[PDB]
């Protein structure tokens, strides 16, 4: 944990989430795994945090969730907003094609004298299932103690495990959550049900205070109750200047 979360990305993500929490009571940051060969942590993978800049509208949780940390959630939609060259890189890094332009819901709004916008929105869909899959009970050839391995993880290594001192003892069925990720573009599915290594939805939310008033969640920060007085002060100062 110290090795993975030492770089600047984790601290920047946490600081962004904290500032968002302070201003408007919501924030988030995701965990993404990646392949690295020059300086691996334990295996040829590295775990890194990633920042989400506007968790108010880019991250959309399940409406049936009831906890603050969204432990009991089965859906999560992240609406990426990215530029043309960013879209080309995104298509390159997966197996997508950069010739068709994806589209989705527009989180941001055109309410400022801004010049241009990216106008390229793509979405990612996370879901969690429980199926009670099977598992194999082996015997450790080094020490005479039983070990259990899931069938799916070692389904291509069963013969190799049999080649070594490992011997099968019995078969069981152990329930375990799994996480799948798919990419949607409001007209078709680009990649369908990719198996994420995790067991929970990577996005970790922070909330302003908390609240469910009648049946809909409400969160607050610091600026909600200081708007009317501030606007009145601005108006009085403007009138006095006039």
């Amino acid at each position: 944990y110290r090795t993975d979360m030492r770089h600047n990305t984790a601290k920047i993500a946490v600081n962004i989430a904290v500032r968002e929490q302070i201003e408007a009571g919501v924030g988030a940051w995701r965990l993404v795994t990646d392949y690295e060969d020059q300086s691996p942590t334990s295996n040829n993978q590295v775990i890194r945090r990633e920042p989400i800049h506007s968790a108010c509208s880019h991250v959309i949780w399940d409406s049936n969730s009831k906890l603050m940390d969204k432990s009991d959630a089965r859906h999560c939609t992240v609406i990426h907003s990215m530029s043309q060259n960013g879209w080309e890189d995104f298509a390159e890094k997966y197996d997508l094609d950069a010739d068709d332009i994806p589209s989705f819901q527009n989180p941001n709004d055109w309410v400022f004298p801004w010049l241009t916008q990216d106008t390229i929105q793509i979405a990612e869909f996370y879901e969690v299932v429980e199926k009670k899959e099977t598992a194999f009970i082996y015997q450790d050839p080094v020490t005479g103690e039983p070990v259990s391995y899931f069938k799916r993880d070692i389904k291509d290594v069963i013969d190799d495990l049999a080649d070594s001192g490992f011997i099968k003892i019995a078969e069981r069925q152990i329930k375990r959550r799994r996480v799948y990720k798919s990419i949607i573009t409001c007209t078709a599915v680009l990649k369908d049900k990719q198996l994420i290594a995790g067991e929970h939805i990577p996005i970790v939310p922070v909330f302003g205070e908390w609240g469910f008033v009648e049946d809909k969640e409400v969160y607050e920060g610091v600026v909600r109750l200081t708007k009317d007085g501030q606007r009145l002060r601005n108006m009085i100062m403007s009138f006095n200047a006039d």
Partner: protein, 192 residues
């Protein structure tokens, strides 16, 4: 306490969730070694840190082997933020020093344990001296042959010490034993 305590608690909850997610990802991806002790008669408390990895023998890619029984056996908690496992140990040693009163063997042990944890090469004299003292007091166990050399040197030097009062008392006892022997000799002198 502070005015932002509720926000701090919410951040702590989010950090606990992040720790849970990270633990799950590590269990599913990385190679966690399993700690087993041989409990040999010659070697006591040997942390072998056994690992298990198998190759497919049909492709260059490896395959992870994590036991299910020993996956979830450490819970997540919220604490201060450091950057390496050495800084955590340094902070704990400093806390124990703060809680330990002066003029106590525990204080000296904590000072030596802190001194043997520095990093810079400029401070190497003190690190080597602290390691030597800790090994010679028998608290630590030698690893590299110079360390067993230090230990055996300390063992040889220990037996050299002698208490003067013990020697003087032994001399007095020998004088008394000689007086008793003289009395027993006087008995035989009477016997003729």
């Amino acid at each position: 306490d502070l005015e932002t305590y509720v926000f701090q608690d919410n951040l702590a909850t989010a950090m606990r969730r992040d720790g849970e997610i990270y633990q799950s990802i590590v269990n599913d991806i990385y190679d966690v070694p399993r700690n087993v002790t041989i409990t040999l008669e010659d070697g006591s408390e040997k942390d072998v840190q056994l690992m298990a990895e198998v190759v497919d023998l049909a492709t260059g890619e490896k395959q992870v082997l994590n036991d299910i029984r020993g996956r979830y056996e450490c819970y997540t908690d919220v604490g201060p933020s450091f950057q390496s496992m050495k800084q955590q140990n340094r902070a704990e040693i400093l806390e124990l020093l703060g809680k330990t009163p002066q003029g106590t063997p525990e204080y000296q042990l904590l000072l030596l344990q802190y001194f043997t944890l520095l990093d810079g090469k400029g401070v190497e004299m003190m690190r080597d001296y602290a390691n030597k003292q800790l090994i010679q007091m028998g608290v630590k166990k030698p690893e590299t042959p110079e360390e067993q050399q230090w230990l055996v040197e300390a063992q040889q030097a220990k037996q050299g010490q002698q208490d003067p009062a013990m020697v003087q008392a032994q001399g007095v006892l020998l004088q008394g034993q000689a007086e008793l022997a003289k009395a027993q000799n006087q008995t035989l002198s009477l016997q003729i």
